[PDB]
């Protein structure tokens, strides 16, 4: 969501095309740094 897109292999080798700007970057980094602080899940109603 903030970049960078996780393809499953080596490519982007010679594809030099940046829609990932910009306020989403620090917020998404915050959310990622927080996901370790928890263990989940709060996303499946069934499991909750």
């Amino acid at each position: 969501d903030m970049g960078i897109q996780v393809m499953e292999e080596a490519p982007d080798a010679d594809d030099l095309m940046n829609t990932a700007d910009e306020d989403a970057a620090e917020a998404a980094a915050q959310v990622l740094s927080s996901v370790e602080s928890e263990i989940g899940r709060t996303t499946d109603p069934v499991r909750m």
Binding site: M17, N18, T19, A24, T43, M48
Partner: protein
């Protein structure tokens, strides 16, 4: 009709006003009698009736009751079009978080409350609690809790304690918060307290808060209470064939939400234990969250097809939503397609059109005309008449067709000539015969390419087509004024075969009374078409003021040239056709006719060229035969000698005299040379091999080998392809780029055997694959470039400025790569052009430099003109016509209204298709021309040797002749030993600079005593001694070897004078102690005074890419990590701390504040002396210079010159021609955000980024007012970043992420003013660019009035 569009939150109240009744039950229809069941997802009484003017009762089936609502079953007798605009609300039993304002990243409920996303996500899914006005006891307002601490503090307090959970809590928070309260509190505690991340985030927050206050929103409308439902016909339940209905997912999603909503309501009625009702609330929340944006957060619910079913966002957002396909590109009526064929009989303003196609696209026209002429009573009778296709229907068709031009369009509309409009010549057939000359534009060919004809209906449309899009109105490529009407292949070969000459043909020598006698002989049969002859031609010239004065003479020509002279219009010399007329000559013939006789005679003359060309290429009978591909006879020798070469290299390899790679390289080398030699043998054998004789012996003339004729007329082919027919077809490459070592030594005239053919197969399939991909990704550059530059329009006649840029001839490496006559043509001069001695004001300051003025410029030998640019214009939200130039697609000048942004993006994306898709690569200063010196940026010393060693950096030598114009460019390296001086006399043959690249001087200014001041041998010196010469060298090492005794000390090699006092360098308070860098070849040790600028210390020791992707990166503006570090300020340089990697270098002014440090990573070789007072915008590291730095240091004009030169060189290395206005307008669209050097009198945050026109309008308004306005800092973003930030949301939400733009524009109440080109297409009104510019103007003055 309307104006700007407002988007915002919607209260529950506004939603209840939108609806026509609430939807309570989840059922759709009645499964046996399929009447829409009340009152569910398809309710007759809520969402309108199902039949036109018939209620669902059946009781009211006449229009006479139209408007009464049947008292039996409530429906309202109206049109079932109404079943597509009504909406209904769903009363939610509990509030619900709108997932858009919740999980958009950044979460708007999050950073409207300054509460972490995780905590709200806890309170929402009931895993937590949250206080809201937790009494006057213990807990702040936003304090999270849990079950446990909750029940604990409840023992403390039953009242004065409010800790809710779920959407109720977030809502009571959102409503309890005070926007003005927290906003002014952030004001106070950001004013009296300031910290970097603190002020950053807190002023961001206060921006959001006062945005919410300025809007009409309410903080808690992010939390749904009433939910709306789409109208039924937009989410229909259509009956397919076989009782198998088809629906859209939205019915399933609405069922899922209504079910759980009702179940929650019944739970709340039953007073259930709050565990089950909690699970029910969470279930309803997931239902609404999958209805709003499925797949957003929780692993989207999949329909019955296994599939993740679509939601409202997916009907809006993404590649498949509304904004993309049906909102930009639709299927259109009055339209057809078919196969184009040639039809050379035409003019270039018509197109054949089959009677079937014509009769079908033009139905209403024929109907109206048949019932106007009385040929048919009614319109039904007219339909019957046409569908019978009577004899008068065809005549009425040809009456209708006459002046109605139809648009022709092709599939990959690469540029604006892909759509043209012609007049239809009815064609009894089934193929759209398209005129030949137009296939160049359309990129068409006749092997199956389908073309699509559109009809323009209204009168404004026909006048647009006939005035703006007719095929006779665009004979100039809009990329550059050169015409796109150049004859292609049958016609250049016919014209070439005509205007040639044998050495002894029929009827040679005779003299003729004129061209009419030439054709009277040729058609009669008495003279070959090319048999040289004297004929009397009378050529006209427009020398006077519109006076075409004739001059006659007996010219020496051929029968063919004089026969072709009858089609040339008046004002053109005979020299235009007395040459051999390949493709280049037959193109520049049309070009000169345009520059002289205007446009009408050029279209007429181009049609005449085509007709005469086809006719005489037919008469020529010019075929191709297998006997025409003449192999040379020195071929087998060349191949044999190359084979002997490779055998000898292989023998050396077998004897260990070479590596493997080097044997391979030499093999490929000898094969490349043998391939070139066979190409030359064959071309020499083939070009002159017609050997004829006249009145005697023999004389070799250029050949008539028809393969050679088609290759040498530019008709079709080249050196290479005949190299493959006659010569050997070379070395073939495998797809990695690694060339196979054995070459096909054969041609196609002799076969390839199985191995050689299997080898050519590799490269052949690689090239095929890369064009089958290069096409599918065709308009990616042009599309990416019109997103950035769409909304730009020539909007003013003149902005009245004197800014501009200094256009100059390009001279790189050696000589000129393009004259000034090109780069200046049709751009408006910014300031006055004076002559060399300046002698008077020659060129006025607002003169459209057309071809006369380009002549009058080169007739005074100027090489620098200040021309107005688009990028340095002054008008806000557009461009004045003068500071742009002249519309090179129309010639005259830009008009107020040309959407130059779109045509610029197209003019860069079209020729971007002729650039390869994958990316792509590549002693002394001896004079070679006649001229005179001129050293630029020179600070040298004339040493005791009489030579010159320049102590500067930017000193390079240009060549200036008798006229003054720059002749040649060269660089003068540091210590380049100049045998000359500067500016004096020179001729070609006296090497001006000899310099050794092994050494880079520390050249002194003084022939004085050496002195090692601050040079500690062993701690700041290394005790080098080259025992070849036996050289005492106290060399200085870097800061990577020596100890801490002289670590940040400075080894100073200085020239003092011959008594023992330090020789000050003239100008400042420093003697010439050149502090030493490391690694220095400091040969002379102290006690030996030397010349003024000897190499006491001696420093020890143009790839270009070419892909289209090199262009994409050139525009994206990426910072290459090997960037030259310019100088942030002129002044005395100085170093500092060492050995960090990040070493200190600082420059002190004479006047300003000195201390600016910069950390040069020591990976890079430094390139400035320790105590050289440096310029501004210099270079220290050398290599790539980031364009951002070029902007911030040298200015806007420097970055535009840089980017224009980068792109122009990438397009020029293949020979693609493109003007400068296009790159300049795209670059202007790049630098359109600025940030302020001083917050100043205005209303701007310091480090906030606003559109440069905003700053420049506010500052003009302020310095017109009392204060003085913002001190801005221009910035530069790539296209992919500048086209993100745009003003509208209807525009920038079409192609961006829909949800983020919609949510931001919703929270901020951002009312879009339709003044762009994407919006006005979406909404469906007139674009502001073209014809519609007048309408938008007069409607902008209607309002504001």
């Amino acid at each position: 009709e309307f104006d700007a569009i407002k988007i915002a939150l919607a209260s529950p109240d506004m939603i209840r006003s939108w609806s026509f009744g609430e939807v309570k039950k989840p059922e759709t229809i009645n499964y046996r009698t399929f009447k829409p069941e009340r009152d569910g997802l398809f309710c007759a009484r809520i969402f309108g009736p199902v039949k036109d003017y018939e209620c669902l009762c059946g009781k009211y089936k006449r229009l006479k009751h139209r408007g009464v609502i049947c008292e039996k079953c409530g429906v309202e007798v109206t049109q079932t079009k109404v079943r597509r605009e009504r909406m209904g609300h769903i009363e939610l039993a509990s509030p619900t978080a709108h997932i858009w304002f919740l999980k958009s990243l950044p979460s708007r409920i999050g950073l409207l409350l300054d509460m972490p996303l995780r905590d709200i996500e806890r309170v929402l899914y009931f895993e937590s609690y949250v206080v809201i006005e937790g009494g006057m006891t213990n807990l702040e307002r936003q304090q999270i809790l849990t079950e446990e601490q909750y029940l604990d503090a409840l023992e403390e307090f039953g009242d004065e304690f409010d800790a809710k959970m779920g959407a109720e809590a977030i809502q009571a928070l959102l409503k309890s918060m005070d926007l003005e309260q927290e906003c002014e509190q952030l004001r106070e505690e950001l004013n009296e307290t300031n910290s970097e991340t603190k002020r950053k985030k807190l002023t961001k927050r206060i921006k959001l808060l006062e945005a919410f206050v300025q809007s009409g929103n309410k903080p808690e409308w992010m939390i749904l209470t009433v939910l709306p439902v789409l109208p039924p016909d937009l989410r229909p339940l259509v009956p397919l064939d076989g009782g198998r209905f088809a629906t859209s997912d939205l019915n399933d999603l609405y069922r899922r939400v209504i079910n759980r909503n009702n179940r929650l309501k019944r739970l709340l009625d039953l007073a259930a234990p709050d565990i089950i009702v909690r699970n029910e609330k969470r279930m309803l929340q997931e239902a609404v969250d999958a209805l709003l944006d499925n797949g957003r957060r929780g692993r989207a619910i999949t329909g019955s097809n296994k599939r993740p079913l679509k939601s409202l966002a997916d009907m809006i957002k993404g590649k498949q939503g509304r904004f993309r396909q049906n909102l930009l590109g639709k299927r259109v009526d009055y339209s057809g397609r078919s196969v184009i064929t040639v039809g050379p009989y035409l003019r270039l303003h018509q197109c054949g059109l089959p009677k079937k196609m014509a009769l079908e696209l033009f139905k209403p026209f024929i109907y109206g005309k048949l019932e106007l002429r009385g040929l048919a009573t009614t319109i039904k009778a007219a339909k019957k008449m046409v569908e019978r296709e009577e004899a008068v229907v065809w005549d009425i068709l040809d009456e209708v067709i006459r002046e109605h031009p139809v648009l022709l369009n092709r599939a990959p509309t690469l540029h604006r000539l892909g759509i043209q409009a012609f007049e239809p010549v009815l064609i009894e057939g089934k193929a759209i015969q398209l005129h030949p000359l137009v296939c160049a534009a359309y990129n068409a060919d006749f092997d199956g390419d389908q073309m699509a004809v559109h009809v323009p209906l209204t009168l404004e449309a026909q006048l647009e087509a006939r005035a703006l899009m007719m095929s006779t109105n665009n004979i100039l490529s809009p990329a550059n004024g050169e015409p796109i009407i150049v004859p292609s292949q049958d016609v250049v070969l016919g014209l070439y075969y005509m205007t040639r000459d044998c050495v002894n043909a029929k009827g040679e020598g005779m003299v003729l009374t004129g061209p009419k006698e030439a054709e009277r002989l040729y058609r009669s049969g008495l003279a070959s078409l090319h048999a040289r002859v004297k004929v009397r031609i009378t050529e006209y010239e427009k020398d006077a003021n519109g006076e075409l004065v004739a001059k006659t003479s007996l010219k020496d020509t051929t029968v063919g040239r004089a026969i072709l002279w009858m089609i040339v219009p008046k004002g053109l010399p005979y020299s235009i056709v007395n040459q051999a007329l390949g493709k280049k000559a037959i193109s520049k013939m049309l070009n000169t006719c345009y520059r002289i006789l205007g446009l009408k005679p050029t279209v007429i003359f181009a049609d005449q060229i085509m007709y005469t060309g086809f006719a005489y290429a037919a008469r020529s009978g010019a075929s191709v035969g297998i006997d025409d591909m003449v192999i040379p006879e020195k071929k087998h020798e060349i191949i044999s000698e190359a084979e002997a070469e490779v055998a000898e290299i292989q023998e050396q390899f077998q004897s260990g005299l070479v590596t493997a790679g080097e044997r391979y390289n030499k093999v490929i080398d000898i094969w490349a040379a043998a391939n070139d030699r066979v190409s030359k043998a064959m071309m020499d054998n083939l070009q002159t091999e017609t050997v004829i004789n006249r009145d005697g012996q023999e004389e070799k003339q250029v050949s008539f080998n028809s393969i050679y004729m088609m290759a040498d007329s530019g008709a079709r082919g080249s050196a290479a392809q005949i190299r493959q027919l006659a010569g050997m077809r070379g070395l073939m490459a495998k797809p990695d780029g690694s060339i196979i070592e054995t070459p096909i030594t054969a041609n196609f005239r002799e076969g390839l055997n199985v191995l050689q053919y299997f080898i050519s197969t590799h490269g052949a399939r690689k090239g095929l694959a890369d064009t089958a991909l290069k096409t599918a990704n065709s308009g990616y550059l042009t599309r990416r470039l019109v997103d950035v530059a769409q909304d730009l329009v020539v909007t003013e006649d003149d902005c009245g400025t004197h800014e501009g840029i200094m256009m100059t001839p390009v001279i790189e490496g050696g000589d000129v790569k393009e004259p000034l006559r090109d780069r200046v043509l049709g751009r408006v001069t910014a300031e006055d052009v004076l002559k060399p001695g300046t002698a008077d004001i020659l060129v006025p300051r607002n003169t459209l430099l057309h071809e006369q003025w380009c002549d009058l410029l080169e007739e005074n030998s100027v090489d620098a003109v200040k021309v107005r640019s688009v990028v340095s214009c002054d008008t806000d939200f557009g461009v004045c016509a003068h500071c742009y130039g002249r519309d090179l697609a129309r010639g005259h000048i830009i008009n107020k209204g040309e959407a130059i942004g779109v045509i610029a993006a197209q003019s860069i994306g079209e020729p971007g298709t002729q650039l390869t898709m994958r990316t792509f690569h590549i002693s002394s200063i001896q004079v070679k021309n006649k001229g005179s010196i001129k050293l630029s940026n020179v600070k040298s010393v004339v040493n005791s040797s009489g030579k010159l060693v320049i102590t500067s950096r930017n000193t390079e030598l240009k060549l200036i002749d008798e006229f003054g114009r720059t002749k040649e460019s060269y660089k003068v390296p540091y210590g380049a030993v100049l045998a000359k001086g500067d500016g004096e006399q020179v001729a070609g043959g006296e090497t001006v600079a000899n310099w050794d690249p092994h050494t880079m001087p520390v050249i002194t200014e003084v022939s004085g005593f050496v002195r090692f001041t601050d040079m500690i041998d062993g701690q700041t010196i290394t005790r080098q001694t080259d025992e070849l010469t036996g050289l005492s060298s106290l060399v200085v090492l870097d800061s990577a070897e020596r100890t801490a005794g002289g670590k940040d000390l400075r080894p100073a090699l200085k020239i003092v004078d011959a008594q023992g006092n330090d020789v000050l360098i003239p100008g400042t308070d420093m003697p010439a102690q050149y502090f030493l860098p490391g690694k220095a070849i400091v040969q002379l040790e102290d006690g030996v005074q030397i010349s003024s600028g000897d190499t006491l210390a001696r420093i020890p020791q143009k790839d270009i890419t070419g892909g289209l992707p090199r262009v994409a990166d050139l525009f994206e503006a990426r910072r290459p990590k090997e960037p030259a570090i310019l100088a942030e300020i002129s002044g005395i340089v100085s170093f500092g701390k060492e050995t960090k990697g990040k070493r200190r270098l600082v420059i002190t002014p004479v006047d300003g504040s000195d201390p600016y440090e910069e950390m040069i990573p020591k990976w890079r070789q430094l390139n400035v002396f320790e105590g050289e007072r440096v310029e501004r915008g210099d270079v220290i590291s050398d290599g790539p210079e980031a364009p951002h730095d070029i902007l911030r240091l040298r200015g806007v004009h420097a970055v535009t010159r840089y980017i224009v030169n980068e792109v122009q060189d990438v397009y020029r290395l293949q020979g693609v021609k493109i003007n400068d206005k296009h790159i300049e307008v795209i670059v202007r669209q790049m630098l359109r955000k600025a940030t302020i050097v001083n917050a100043g009198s205005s209303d701007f945050l310091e480090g906030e980024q606003v559109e440069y026109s905003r700053v420049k309008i506010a500052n003009r308004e302020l310095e017109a007012n009392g204060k003085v306005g913002a001190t801005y800092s221009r910035d530069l973003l790539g296209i992919t970043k500048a086209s993100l930030a745009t003003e509208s949301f209807i525009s920038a939400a079409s192609f961006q992420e829909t949800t983020r733009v919609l949510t931001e524009a919703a929270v901020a109440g951002k009312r879009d003013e339709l003044r762009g080109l994407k919006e006005n297409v979406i909404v469906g009104r007139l674009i502001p660019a073209g014809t519609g510019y007048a309408y938008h103007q007069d409607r902008m003055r209607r309002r504001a009035a």
